[PDB]
Design a binder for this molecule. Sequence first.
Ligand SMILES: [Mg+2]
Ligand SMILES: [Mg+2]
Ligand SMILES: [Mg+2]
Length: 799
Amino acid sequence: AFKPPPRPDFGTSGRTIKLQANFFEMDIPKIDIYHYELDIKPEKCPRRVNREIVEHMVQHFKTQIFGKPVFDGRKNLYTAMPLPIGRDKVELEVTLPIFKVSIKWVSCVSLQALHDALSGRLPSVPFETIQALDVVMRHLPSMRYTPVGRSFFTASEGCSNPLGGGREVWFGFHQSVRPSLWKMMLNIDVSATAFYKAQPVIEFVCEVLDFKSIEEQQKPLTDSQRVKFTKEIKGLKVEIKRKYRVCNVTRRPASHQTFCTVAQYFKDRHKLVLRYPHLPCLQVGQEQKHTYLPLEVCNIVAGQRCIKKLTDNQTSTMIRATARSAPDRQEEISKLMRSADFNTDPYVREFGIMVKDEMTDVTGRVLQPPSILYGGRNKAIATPVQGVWDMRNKQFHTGIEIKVWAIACFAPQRQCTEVHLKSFTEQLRKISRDAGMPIQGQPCFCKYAQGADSVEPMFRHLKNTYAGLQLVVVILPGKTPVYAEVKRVGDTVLGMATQCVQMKNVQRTTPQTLSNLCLKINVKLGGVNNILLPQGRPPVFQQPVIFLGADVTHPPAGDGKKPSIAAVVGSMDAHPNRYCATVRVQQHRQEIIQDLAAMVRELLIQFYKSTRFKPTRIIFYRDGVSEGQFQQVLHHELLAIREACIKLEKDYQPGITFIVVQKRHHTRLFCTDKNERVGKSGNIPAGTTVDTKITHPTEFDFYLCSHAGIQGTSRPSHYHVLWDDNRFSSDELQILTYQLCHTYVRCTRSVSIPAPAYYAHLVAFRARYHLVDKEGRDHQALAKAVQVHQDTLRTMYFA
RNA sequence: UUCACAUUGCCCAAGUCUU
RNA sequence: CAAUGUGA
Ligand SMILES: [Mg+2]
Ligand SMILES: [Mg+2]
Ligand SMILES: [Mg+2]
């Protein structure tokens, strides 16, 4: 239940392709380095303050200690050669513009043992060793640049990327030390994030309040101006030599604001006559004291990342400033590494480390896509080309016959007229007839409505009046709270199928849009759009098997009380195509799925009810777990799956395959040959697979870019097998995973992650919609909100 | 709320110390 | 999913 399986073999399927990865080979010396535990009293200091302390400490004691050590900003210091210490704590006293620093040797870290672990010699990779190398590579940039996670950001020289609102774009790069089949690798990728400009607060006001210049005007701000400004600068730090954090903007101008007025105080003591006394002051420091700074004598301090959400316009600017095709990104990574010059870094060089300046070459394989079987009389077979196919002259494998349906238009009648609805209905019936999902009649019901209050009574009337009602098509004017209400009533209250459509897609229809629309409708009504060509599937389908997709979605940044949402879906046929969903609310920002055992039990029960088979195997696709959570998550969740089986029957012990899916990492793959690049974005082809060189030295993992890259640089999904009772070969599991990317019903394309994992996202996001403005007695309220109706339980409402 | 892809938002990481 | 783009 605890240790991941070794790599069974290497894949052999598919034609080869020359790739370049943003991994850079590291040459590590085979010598012991020396680990020391520090202490710094007081120890509530920010991490960067601790780096200053040790930095000054190193030189302020250079003489009979420290004859170029590295430091993690907390508690760990490393040297390439040993110090004079013994094992003794050597408390030092250091002063920086009153600190006690204790230095104690702890262990010897052998880089020799790392070479063995990267080889077949040692069974596993020693974390503490890679942890040390990480501190070596991060030492310099952690003081030179502004750390954000595993990245480093800085104001770009000579350029300025303003966002407005006192914000601008800082470019940066991600850095991480990784073991691999070949060598140690330095993974480098470029990135960009928003920062507040280091400008006078006076000019910060102008951008926030949209003033061309101050003295526009010379009257104290309106309360509406003062409230907007207070929201932006509160929590931000400002400087004079001495730095404060802003907690409040005073109501009264500096001329009147008394504590002795602020204006007066600065006239006598500091001999400063304020140029804009009519403006308020910044209350800084402790909220329960009376320290007020005029705007004129304050600057926003540099290197403060913008945590708040960007505006629509700010986002739009951010996108344009950082959007890059795959070759363009490739060159920006390359240019960065040449200019980075990691080998002159004195700390990197103290530890005798060398970093390759060229991207690593890696050979991938482009897997063949599966054939997609359709229905109708002809039973057409689609052949994905470059990750895409279409439904033209093809009918659904199992198309639904729609006899009873209705339209509910919440768009204004002037904007969405009966003629519009009629034409839309005309075209939709045409497309749906072609697709093998005939809408036999005009809707038995069609009424306009307004507001969220009209939803439930209308839907209740519909359910009571029209027997055999299959669907309600809901027209929406755009972004409106009605949508969430439609889904609350439909999914959870009354248990009725609904398909919403934006007004603009009714006024002006297209064959493609209407086609995609039918894909959702047919699925929602129990249909089967298409299936994998049966004889083209991997051998695993010879026995009953269920495919589980699982994901947790956490609240946005800055949020503190909203629940995390766990969603799990399971296949309900042998194709596989039909899926049922389970969903739960759980603790804030907890990744481990707490109630998984219960959820899997439901899915296993519903699988048997649907197929009359008991799975002999369980394939578990787990999205979004990082390497630092593999053991924790696997321990709880693998056992939870077993628990579900055991509490059901026997002696029922199906083989479990546990696979972690990671779409969001920092590995990027590029075509070496320009003639391999695909489309305008110039990305690697769909099906590109990498399970060598850059992958894990001992464990079963691979990259699979299963989708066509439309824009930017494609994210190759990474798959890591944490458990496998079924003993998959690399070829079978990679093909299986790839084929499951072709079973996503909402489009005739290969998607970036397997359908079950994708559905899990959709289910989680739907639950989040049921919880809008609603997020023991607390838990049960939220739990009921995400609980769907009895009639919705076995449906694909999430489509 | 036709859909995918891409950027950010999500576990780990990161962050958090005389007017 | 939301914002913003590229696309069908
Ligand atoms: Mg997740
Ligand atoms: Mg943490
Ligand atoms: Mg969007």
